[PDB]
């Protein structure tokens, strides 16, 4: 990555490489993997980002899909930045580290106006990973319903865990989806939640339904 001592290259750390590998091994493409990827890639060059993706041994269907998404984003980059000052010009393939050298990547990122090819590529990789997280979500939110004996907290944990994966975003918080949380609750709690009226907070809903299981 590029770090401050002045901005200098400082090699990917052995810990970071291992941390990313183990996060994929243990969590696969659970939604929280994505914020972890972005954090582990602080300051990464395009080269460094490719190293992290390539160090993944399994999940090669997902990784091939990721390449397709990256190529699509690169082509759109070229569409938005066509061949015509006129100092330098990163292309889509240069941003992905495919046709650029480490030397070119450091050059673009450290110029003043910086062209942050690492951040652009990281955006595309995350764009791809979001799609993978959505693809590998095992259950639809429509199929999440509170069990007869399930504590409301456990249902809400399940509800927002899938909502996070199917949305590939930690807070859908959509209006219609706050309607669904109430409608799919168990009979006793739903009556309690309906009586709460409009605008009840999640905090208020969980307090209201305490004791339903008991």
């Amino acid at each position, epitope marked *: 990555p590029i770090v401050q001592n002045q901005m200098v290259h400082q090699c990917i750390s052995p810990r970071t490489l291992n941390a990313w590998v183990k996060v994929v091994e243990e969590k696969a493409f659970s939604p929280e993997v994505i914020p972890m990827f972005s954090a582990l890639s602080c300051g990464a060059t395009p080269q460094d980002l490719n190293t992290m993706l390539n160090t993944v041994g399994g999940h090669q269907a997902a990784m091939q899909m990721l390449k397709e998404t990256i190529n699509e984003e690169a082509a759109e980059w070229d569409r938005l930045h066509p061949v015509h000052g006129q100092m330098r010009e990163p292309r889509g393939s240069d941003i992905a580290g495919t046709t650029s050298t480490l030397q070119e990547q450091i050059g673009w990122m450290t110029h003043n106006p910086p062209i942050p090819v690492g951040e652009i590529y990281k955006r595309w990789i995350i764009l791809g990973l979001n799609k993978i997280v959505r693809m590998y979500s095992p259950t639809s939110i429509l199929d999440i319903r509170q069990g007869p004996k399930e504590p409301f907290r456990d249902y809400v944990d399940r509800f927002y865990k899938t909502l996070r994966a199917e949305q590939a975003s930690q807070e859908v918080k959509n209006a219609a989806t706050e309607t669904l949380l109430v409608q799919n609750a168990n009979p006793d709690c739903k009556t309690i939640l*309906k*009586a*709460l009226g409009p605008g009840a907070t999640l905090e208020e809903m969980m*307090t209201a339904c305490q004791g339903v299981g008991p």
Partner: nanobody
Amino acid sequence: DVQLQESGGGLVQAGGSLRLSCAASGSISRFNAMGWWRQAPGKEREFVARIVKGFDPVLADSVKGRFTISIDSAENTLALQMNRLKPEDTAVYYCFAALDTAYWGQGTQVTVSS
């Protein structure tokens, strides 16, 4: 095991005041939420007030300036104070309590007119 009875409703003039009271079985210490709804015949059930254990009172937009909801834990009773009554206030008012399910009272008639 439990049950509520409303009282305090009646006929008052517009611009008047009224105080409804909801008596509770047991102690209101265990209820996790109580509140007030109203319905006039042919009008949809409307939400009036809510109190959830540990939280501030929440009131509906149509009543926000004029009503107060309070809890008297000493007497085990739930009060809804109504002021500045309007034509929109004619309705039957129900209190609700939350434990293992939702328990409701039978309602009290409030008729406001000028």
